Write a protein that binds this ligand. Sequence first.
Ligand SMILES: CC(C)(C)OC(=O)NCCOCCOc1ccccc1-c1nnc(Nc2ccc(CC(N)=O)cc2F)c2ccsc12
Ligand SMILES: Nc1nc2c(ncn2[C@@H]2O[C@H](COP(=O)(O)OP(=O)(O)NP(=O)(O)O)[C@@H](O)[C@H]2O)c(=O)[nH]1
Ligand SMILES: [Mg+2]
Ligand SMILES: [Mg+2]
Lengths: 167, 892
Amino acid sequence: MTEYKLVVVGAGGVGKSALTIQLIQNHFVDEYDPTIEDSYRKQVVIDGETCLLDILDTAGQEEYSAMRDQYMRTGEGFLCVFAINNTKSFEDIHHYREQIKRVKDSEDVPMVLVGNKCDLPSRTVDTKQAQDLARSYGIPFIETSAKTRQGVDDAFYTLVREIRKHK
Amino acid sequence: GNREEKILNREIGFAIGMPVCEFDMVKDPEVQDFRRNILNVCKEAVDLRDLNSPHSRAMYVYPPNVESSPELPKHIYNKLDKGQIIVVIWVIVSPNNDKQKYTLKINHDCVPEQVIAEAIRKKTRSMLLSSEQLKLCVLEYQGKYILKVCGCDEYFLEKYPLSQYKYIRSCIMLGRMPNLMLMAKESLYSQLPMDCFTMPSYSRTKSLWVINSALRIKILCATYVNVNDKIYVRTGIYHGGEPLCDNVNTQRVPCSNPRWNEWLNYDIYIPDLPRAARLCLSICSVKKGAKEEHCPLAWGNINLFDYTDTLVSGKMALNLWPVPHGLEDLLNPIGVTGSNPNKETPCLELEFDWFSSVVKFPDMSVIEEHANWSVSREALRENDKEQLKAISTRDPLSEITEQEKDFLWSHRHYCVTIPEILPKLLLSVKWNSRDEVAQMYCLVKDWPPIKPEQAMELLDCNYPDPMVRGFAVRCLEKYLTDDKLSQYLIQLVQVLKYEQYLDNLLVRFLLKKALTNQRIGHFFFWHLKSEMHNKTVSQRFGLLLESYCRACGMYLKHLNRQVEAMEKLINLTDILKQEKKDETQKVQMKFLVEQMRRPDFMDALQGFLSPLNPAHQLGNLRLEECRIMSSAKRPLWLNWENPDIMSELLFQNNEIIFKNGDDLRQDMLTLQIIRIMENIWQNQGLDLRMLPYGCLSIGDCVGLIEVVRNSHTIMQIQCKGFNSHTLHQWLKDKNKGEIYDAAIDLFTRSCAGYCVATFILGIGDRHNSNIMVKDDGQLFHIDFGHFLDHERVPFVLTQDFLIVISKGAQECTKTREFERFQEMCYKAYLAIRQHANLFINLFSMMLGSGMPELQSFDDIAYIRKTLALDKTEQEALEYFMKQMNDAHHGGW
Ligand SMILES: CC(C)(C)OC(=O)NCCOCCOc1ccccc1-c1nnc(Nc2ccc(CC(N)=O)cc2F)c2ccsc12
Ligand SMILES: Nc1nc2c(ncn2[C@@H]2O[C@H](COP(=O)(O)OP(=O)(O)NP(=O)(O)O)[C@@H](O)[C@H]2O)c(=O)[nH]1
Ligand SMILES: [Mg+2]
Ligand SMILES: [Mg+2]
């Protein structure tokens, strides 16, 4: 059975852990427990192909930025998540992609850009300004909401199909 | 007679290498009484394992590998993030045994239960089903799990501080992130074996001082002498190593008809014989125009009293042992007592005086009355108090003058306030005087306890009195922790050869600790098994191994797998040398793989515990990676599989060197001292990192050596492409960025440690093949063949090392970094000099071992010259300048 090594990066508080908890146990959490580096896994059939998802949740805080070089080396795909409310998360998401492209010298690496917190009815990041950044990176873009399960399956499923294209 | 006993007796015979039925053939009552009376130590130790089952059994099988003190030095705490540590907690999902992880950030004070409680709270917050999760989950599931080190069989079973465990401690120092695995308590307790210990079937007058006569011994004749002049026997009454009177000989007799029938009178009165007085004899020979040369042919020692406190009498005969390697005298008093089992040896027939009644040694009821009589027949300055304390700080091998001995003996009653002066006070006692020995027995009876490192001095060859040694064991039974017992276990086994009786107090302390700590009993088994080839100690260690194998529980099966695995490696390396030693290494390997692909050898070398570390499981033998090394005596590089469920989180393959031809006892002693030197430096601020790798002699010149990964020799680095700047460029290429100064720091610190250690110990001359460097810059040495004597500096820092120390300057001798370097060498030198008493003791406890470099105290006296113990602390530091100047041709 094929296994996919997915990594979820982003800034602090963007809701990258609630996306994973909403995937495995379909539970939404409100208590912000900062994560250092936890790993999850759950199998599911995608495009008629049963597979395994090796999800690795990272830390959004700049405190544990030294551990970035490790999980950016073993990760097959990447799930760049930013907060729609936090404008800084959309700014320093550039520093994450260029750092991935440094450890992995290949410019085209499996990666999708995810816009979490879309359920919050106070949008700050333009809905269309992420596509031109996704087109400049050459990667898909999904708007997800950890509180209503909206698109959190498609965003993870799209990354699994994105890794298939990079071979 | 029992069906189960016949199976266990055969299983003990395989482990000890000899059938236990030979122990039943021994007619010596001291042997048969030892086999019986030693059994209560087994019962008490087994009763300890079953006291709080199953936790007490788990503590036995998996004892916590913990440090000596929970306190952390300053430089160790500074590496913590605000006093906290980040630990990776792994878990196994039951279906496909694939692992997920949590990463927690906790204080180093947290006990293992609190680490699990933090992990419980981390999970309960993810699942949105809360209610009152603290009401049940935090307390119902808290004691249901235990932490386990990923990669080996080490468990955190006791409520120690997490940072006090040795695995967590090194991760703080080395900066690595600890990976732990949660497993259920019910799972571990289900693997624990059943304790089925049953008692074996074999478990079911005149005073000495009332005899006015001189000690005389008769020498009848000698049998089975080998012809190639004249021969004679030389005798001497010894109390340990010191004679009680002048040695006497018999008149010369030609070797053709060796018979004397000659009495030998000694300058000692019978009532003045101490408890441990011994007779040391040997058969010597003399050899027109050349000076006559005296040479001892055979030797033998006799206890004047037996284990029943009865003075020996009547006719007696004993077979003498062959002379050891290069004796200095005609006698061997330090040798073991007893007759040679090989009856095809020179047998000497003797005769002792027989008095009308059985002469026994007086009990302490009579000795105490004699002391009160002598002290009453004789019937508080402060300046003398200063001199008494000045004598306590003297090194064990310091010259104590006759005036100081008479000064110590006069204030013997005031010496109890300074209890560490006891070893100096005992050596100032005339043991050929029952008047002094009686008064000294009263002082020892009430003497205050002392530190364990100090009490070990009273267990060497200088203190053979049972009352002296009994005091030392009591100090170990109360103060010696299991951590320090594992450290000084090599010494405590050797000093068993000094006890004149099989059933003593030191053996009961080690046997009980071995049957209570399986990690202790593991090496206690191999330290004894490695000397069963020595026929001088085969009987003592064989009976002790039998009692341990009869009570160690299920671990005997694990030991047997290790024994059979080593026997296969021994037999293969023997026939490899016996048949293909001159053949090329290419055809030596094709012979090796054919023997190792055999079915009987394959399963015998797979699925057992590492003798170097019983927590290391060895799985399948990777034939593809095994090879014969390019050394002299054909070492075997062996590669095993780590069969742990999370082997990759530590190491996936286990590499061990099996050597067959070289003696590894000197390398064990040097590595043990290096580990203590690093422990002394780290315990007072000096962060000098050594590499005391694993080593273990498992027999006569056979043993195992731990493989250190990511290490290369400086010859292997210089050949990568005799330039002095080749070493610095490789460390810069291997460590580029902000990790450069860290690699430079680790190099000069490890370089200073081995520079001070090799000079003090005086190890073999280091060259370009005895110095290795790791990838992070750590420097260490290998192949500690010789030490001590043969003012020589072995680790002469060449310009290749001086360049990288100063980060590659134009003149490596004049740099601010080189001033920091020698400043560390000065602190490390004076650090070992303060604890110099401990190191001198560790060598004197190893004299009984048959080691070539350790023959007399004159060999041990070498460390007094390199440490300058007869000088002040200011002169000694200026003596170390001979290394920085005379050896380096410039410095200081
Ligand atoms: C408190 C009790 C005992 C009721 O919680 C459990 O029953 N725990 C689960 C069983 O694991 C066995 C017991 O483990 C534990 C026991 C005590 C405390 C914590 C855990 C623990 N639990 N889960 C961890 N990861 C983990 C994440 C997500 C999934 C779900 C998925 N389909 O991906 C499964 C997972 F396993 C991790 C990772 C490091 S510790 C740990
Ligand atoms: N309204 C809303 N809140 C969300 C959403 N996703 C996450 N949050 C909230 O955002 C907060 C942080 O979420 P978390 O998943 O812990 O963020 P993270 O990106 O993993 N943080 P770190 O990596 O620093 O641990 C929580 O209060 C959570 O409830 C979402 O889709 N909508
Ligand atoms: Mg998080
Ligand atoms: Mg190894």
